[PDB]
Design a binder for this molecule. Structure first.
Ligand SMILES: [K+]
Ligand SMILES: [Mg+2]
Ligand SMILES: [Mg+2]
Ligand SMILES: [Mg+2]
Ligand SMILES: [Mg+2]
Ligand SMILES: [Mg+2]
Ligand SMILES: [Mg+2]
Ligand SMILES: [Mg+2]
Ligand SMILES: [Mg+2]
Ligand SMILES: [Mg+2]
Ligand SMILES: [Mg+2]
Ligand SMILES: [Mg+2]
Ligand SMILES: [Mg+2]
Ligand SMILES: [Mg+2]
Ligand SMILES: [Mg+2]
Ligand SMILES: [Mg+2]
Ligand SMILES: [Mg+2]
Ligand SMILES: [Mg+2]
Ligand SMILES: [Mg+2]
Ligand SMILES: [Mg+2]
Ligand SMILES: [Mg+2]
Ligand SMILES: [Mg+2]
Ligand SMILES: [Mg+2]
Ligand SMILES: [Mg+2]
Ligand SMILES: [Mg+2]
Ligand SMILES: [Mg+2]
Ligand SMILES: [Mg+2]
Ligand SMILES: [Zn+2]
Lengths: 60, 118, 127, 80, 155, 98, 24, 206
RNA sequence: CCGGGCACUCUAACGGGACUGCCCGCGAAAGCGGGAGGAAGGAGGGGACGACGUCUGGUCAGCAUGGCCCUUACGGCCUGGGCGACACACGUGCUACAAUGCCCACUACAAAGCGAUGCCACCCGGCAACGGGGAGCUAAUCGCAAAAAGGUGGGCCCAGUUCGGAUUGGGGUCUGCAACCCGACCCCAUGAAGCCGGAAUCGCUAGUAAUCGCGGAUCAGCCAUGCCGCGGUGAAUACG
């Protein structure tokens, strides 16, 4: 998560295809869930902390 | 009988028999037997001389076939090599042309497996 | 007049309505042999009747949905058993040894991470 | 077994350059980094320097080369 | 089975002859979990048994299974650093299992075209006392009792 | 004839709010048809436990959305007196249609 | 088998439609 | 590689979410980012007051932020201008124009976040780590708190080798779902490295 | 489908239900064996859950962080190339080597999910990928949709073939500013090795293995045969 790459947020990415998604919390590039806008690691952390409403541990 | 070249299929269904023509698969065999009005179920030995003449007349000049087909494919590959194209380079070395990997199996283009030391 | 049984097997339900008649069965508007007969175990769905050896005293109207047709056959078996028991409770003593009134609780085991199909561990060579 | 679509794509970078050269003559080597562009007939006879990632190779274009890409004649990798 | 004794599975009886042995033979015929195909194969083989033999196919089937059952087998044992082929008797369950497995396996070795014909011919030949399955029984009862000198390694 | 679609992440809150609506509409309206379960929408998320390779743990979570279908008949003019501003629940969204 | 483009099982395995697997 | 988070392990029973609001799939991530910015700016300004939890609730463009602080006198300020400035920054960051609430925490030695924060402060002041953990667990146990546990990670005392000082007493049944264990985590930023402080406080059974 | 009604099915909240309670035998007891009743028993089946610690295990490349080092470049922008290189070696898989099979036609049952710059019924053009038109759906009510193995009928008749679809030639579609390096898909042509695999070695004890299809996350598209789930058919064996 280099600082320059946090330039991802860009009203002018010059192309629609070049616009990818990043983790808003840690700046991750891969495993970026679109529903939460986070990565998988920040997802797990904030889910454990209980800061994601309705998110519960699954077991069946 | 002798249809569209010096090749003769015999004693099986006419469509599967035409599959033994180089420029003809199952789709082209079905198309020929359909436009020629021939039952694809009959065997080759159960074909009328008129039906053989009809099928020969149709197929002989409706697509490019064995000799001209192989010559045209060789000319295409030769043209790719002569123009210095990348595909011509891949043909020149005996490597995959359609963007497959070479660090591994892609052996069917490279022939047998020439093991070395290491 | 009419005796009802539910039955259930491997995610499948089959409403069984027993009405005294000739002995011919309807399943979802189709005949018993036009849904089945291509499935050899289909006869098993009529085993409860053979258990009491009636086989001709009850026409059946069955509405089946869920799982595949084999689980449907076994659900029909259990539904016929339940309706026949509701007809006469004294039949339970004749159906309990055969276990036709037993519910088959075998269900597809849930698939689990790290494996291939819920138990098939991925092959490893170690060298 | 290849195709792109109707309305063949050519990068307008060298498209104007080659016709500007034709308007006055047969000017020498042109340097182009756009190897994605498609070869058009109005390029036959010129000599385009195509950037292969390291240098510019002097790809001379002939008649039978129309339709392909500039990168097909500018190999990028070195082997043996 | 270390802790327990691994009680044997009880199979459902047959839908036609009411025999659990027929169901076990079906299961040994079954492939990739295709029960209906195995039942088709076996019952068409039974229809082949008749019109070729006046005897009911159930009797021929059971007599063939009895003719394939081996009495003694030979298991390996590591003694004194070496490996020996020790003869020993066979429990009835293993007799039945080996009989059905050998019946199916020898049937699929036949040159017959379709499966029902293979199974029917193998059942008939095994009932009258020949075929690949009886050859397997003879080979096992030859290996065993061919190493009688190791009978004291029975364990 | 008023469509009510409740949705939420907690079944207890939705159930309490639905019973509150039913009791507030019984005294002021007609015979209410009660709530209908409206099956749950479950959305699962599988995510590796560790920040590195460790591929075979995955600790998946879930997020479920429950819905309710009160659907009061006879929208009497007296019914909305005890309604349209009386509510405890917070994490519950309400949908109203004609 | 499932690797032939011109078959029904091939289209099903590859999850596509075409001449050899229409949509009724 | 074990011992999953207990608060997340009990988010169903005996523990509720900090953020409790409904949002569609097109709006969940935005409200989540907003809650994250709220908690970020909150934990940066109210650390001197000792905040233990920040509950966020949303209905329609209104957010009932309830901050549980052991010392509300710091978050209130003189006459109430501190809460005014904080609501001002809140309305500036998010254009939702929402209110704010403060809740005092009786016996702050029963909220594991504040316990871990106290231990981390003591560690940062160059205090005896073993004695710090022992005293913290003692202060927790000596007021209710049927169970207590405090864990401090490597580099204890500034040593070169990373260690772990255990120092727990009481009852901490981490596998019991109905345990109702408050869990807190704090950091100690030292000249020689980083210290992780974990706090478990067990109270109640059903 | 309408009238019509919450019995059944389903849906989702709560609750009941199994505790060796009862019977027989053994036993000091705990408990063990068997039985009854029961939907189910002797932990009913499956998850979640994984102690003090060990591997100075893994990751400062998710993040945080001590120290060290670079600061007209070890920072930053861009075009292009590369991560897809191939004499070779191994691991994980997919597809097969066929008749318990392959192909064509007709026909019958599932669960869990996803869907508004979205899913796209349906109509027309097109062999098709697809395009044009265009209904519905904030979605138990519309769409993805067809489940496949299966059944019924017919073709193939043991041959590297109506097995198997690698490779290559040619013609196209779609995404995208852009498919040369380096996408998927469609159509015609091509038809490879492969006849069940040496030494060695792997998984699984019941709805399990095996086999069959279905969805999802990331994603404009996709090299997904991966991964995480879902249901259909459904074994063999355990002396020790
Ligand atoms: K270590
Ligand atoms: Mg950084
Ligand atoms: Mg992208
Ligand atoms: Mg040919
Ligand atoms: Mg390559
Ligand atoms: Mg399965
Ligand atoms: Mg075009
Ligand atoms: Mg044999
Ligand atoms: Mg584990
Ligand atoms: Mg084929
Ligand atoms: Mg009711
Ligand atoms: Mg009921
Ligand atoms: Mg436990
Ligand atoms: Mg190391
Ligand atoms: Mg790579
Ligand atoms: Mg090399
Ligand atoms: Mg060399
Ligand atoms: Mg290796
Ligand atoms: Mg049409
Ligand atoms: Mg409806
Ligand atoms: Mg047939
Ligand atoms: Mg062939
Ligand atoms: Mg060969
Ligand atoms: Mg052969
Ligand atoms: Mg086990
Ligand atoms: Mg996708
Ligand atoms: Mg897939
Ligand atoms: Zn992140």
């Amino acid at each position: 998560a280099r600082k320059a790459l946090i330039e991802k947020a860009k009203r002018t990415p010059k192309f629609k295809v070049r616009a990818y998604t990043r983790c808003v919390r840690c700046g991750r590039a891969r495993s970026v869930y679109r529903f939460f806008g986070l990565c998988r690691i920040c997802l797990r952390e904030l889910a454990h902390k209980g800061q994601l409403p309705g998110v519960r541990k699954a077991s069946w | 009988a002798r249809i569209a070249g010096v090749e003769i299929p015999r004693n099986k269904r006419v469509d599967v028999a035409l599959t033994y023509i180089y420029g003809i698969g199952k789709a082209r065999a079905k198309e020929a037997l359909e436009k020629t009005g021939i039952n694809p179920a009959t065997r080759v030995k159960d074909l009328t001389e008129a039906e053989v003449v009809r099928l020969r007349e149709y197929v002989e000049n409706t697509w490019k076939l064995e000799g001209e087909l192989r010559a045209e494919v060789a000319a295409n590959i030769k043209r790719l090599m002569d123009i210095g194209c990348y595909r011509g380079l891949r043909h020149r070395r005996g490597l995959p042309v359609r963007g497959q990997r070479t660090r591994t199996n892609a052996r069917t283009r490279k022939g047998p497996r020439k093991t070395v030391a290491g | 007049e009419q005796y009802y049984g539910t039955g259930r097997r491997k995610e499948a339900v089959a409403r069984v309505f027993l009405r005294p008649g000739n002995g011919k069965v309807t399943v979802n508007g189709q005949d018993f042999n036009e849904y089945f007969q291509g499935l050899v175990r289909a006869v098993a769905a009529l085993e409860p009747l053979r258990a009491v050896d009636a086989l001709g005293h009850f026409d059946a109207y069955i509405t089946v949905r869920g799982g595949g047709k084999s689980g449907q056959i076994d659900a029909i078996k259990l539904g016929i058993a339940r309706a026949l028991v509701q007809y006469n409770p004294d039949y339970r003593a004749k159906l309990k040894p055969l276990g036709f009134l037993t519910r088959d609780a075998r269900v597809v085991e849930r698939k689990k991470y790290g494996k291939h199909k819920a138990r098939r561990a991925p092959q490893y060579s170690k060298r | 077994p290849r195709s792109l679509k109707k309305g063949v794509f050519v990068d307008d970078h060298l498209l104007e350059k080659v016709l500007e050269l034709n308007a006055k003559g047969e000017k020498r080597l042109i340097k182009t980094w756009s190897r994605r562009s498609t070869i058009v007939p109005e390029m036959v006879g010129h000599t385009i320097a195509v950037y292969n990632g390291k240098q510019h190779v002097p790809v001379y274009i002939t008649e039978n080369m129309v339709g392909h890409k500039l990168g097909e004649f500018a190999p990028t990798r070195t082997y043996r | 089975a270390r802790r327990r004794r691994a009680e044997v599975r009880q199979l459902q009886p047959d839908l036609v002859y009411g025999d659990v042995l027929v169901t076990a033979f079906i299961n040994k015929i079954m492939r990739d979990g295709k029960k209906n195909l195995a039942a088709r194969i076996f019952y068409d083989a039974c229809k082949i048994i008749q019109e070729k033999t006046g005897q009911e196919p159930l009797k021929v089937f059971k007599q063939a299974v009895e003719n394939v059952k081996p009495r003694m087998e030979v298991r390996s044992r590591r003694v004194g650093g070496a490996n020996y082929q020790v003869p020993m008797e066979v429990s009835p369950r293993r007799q039945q299992s080996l009989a059905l497995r050998w019946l199916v396996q020898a049937a699929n070795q036949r040159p017959e075209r379709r499966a029902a014909v293979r199974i029917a011919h193998e059942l008939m030949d095994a009932a009258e006392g020949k075929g690949g399955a009886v050859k397997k029984k003879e080979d096992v009862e030859r290996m065993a009792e061919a190493n009688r000198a190791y009978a004291h390694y029975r364990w | 004839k008023i469509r009510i679609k409740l949705r939420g992440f907690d079944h207890k809150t939705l159930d309490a709010s639905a019973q509150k609506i039913v009791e507030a509409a019984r005294r002021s309206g007609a015979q209410v048809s009660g709530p209908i379960p409206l099956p749950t929408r479950v959305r699962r998320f599988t995510v590796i436990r560790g920040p590195f390779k460790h591929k075979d743990s995955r600790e998946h979570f879930e997020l479920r959305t429950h819905n309710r279908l009160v659907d009061i008949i006879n929208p009497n003019r007296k019914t909305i007196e005890q309604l349209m501003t009386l509510d405890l629940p917070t994490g519950v969204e309400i949908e109203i249609k004609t | 088998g499932k690797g032939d483009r011109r078959t029904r099982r091939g289209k099903i395995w590859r999850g596509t439609y075409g001449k050899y697997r229409p949509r009724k | 590689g074990n011992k999953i988070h207990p608060i997340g392990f009990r988010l169903g029973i005996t523990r509720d979410w900090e953020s409790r609001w409904y949002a569609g799939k097109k709006q969940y991530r935005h409200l989540l980012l907003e809650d994250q910015r709220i908690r970020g700016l909150l934990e940066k300004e109210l650390y001197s007051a000792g905040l233990a939890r920040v509950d966020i609730e949303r209905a329609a463009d209104n957010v009932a932020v309830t901050v549980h602080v052991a010392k509300p006198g710091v978050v209130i300020g003189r006459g109430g201008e501190r809460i005014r400035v904080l609501r001002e920054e809140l309305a500036k960051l998010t254009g939702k124009n929402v209110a704010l609430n403060v809740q005092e925490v009786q016996n702050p030695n029963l909220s594991a976040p504040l316990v871990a924060q106290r231990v981390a402060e003591q560690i940062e002041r160059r205090f005896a780590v073993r004695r710090a953990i022992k005293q913290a667990v003692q202060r927790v146990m000596e007021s209710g708190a049927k169970g207590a546990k405090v864990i401090v990670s490597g580099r204890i005392g500034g040593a070169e080798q990373a260690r772990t000082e255990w120092a727990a007493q009481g009852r901490v049944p981490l596998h019991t779902l109905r345990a109702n264990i408050d869990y807190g985590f704090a950091l100690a930023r030292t000249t020689y490295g980083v210290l992780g402080v974990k706090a478990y406080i067990f109270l109640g059974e059903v």
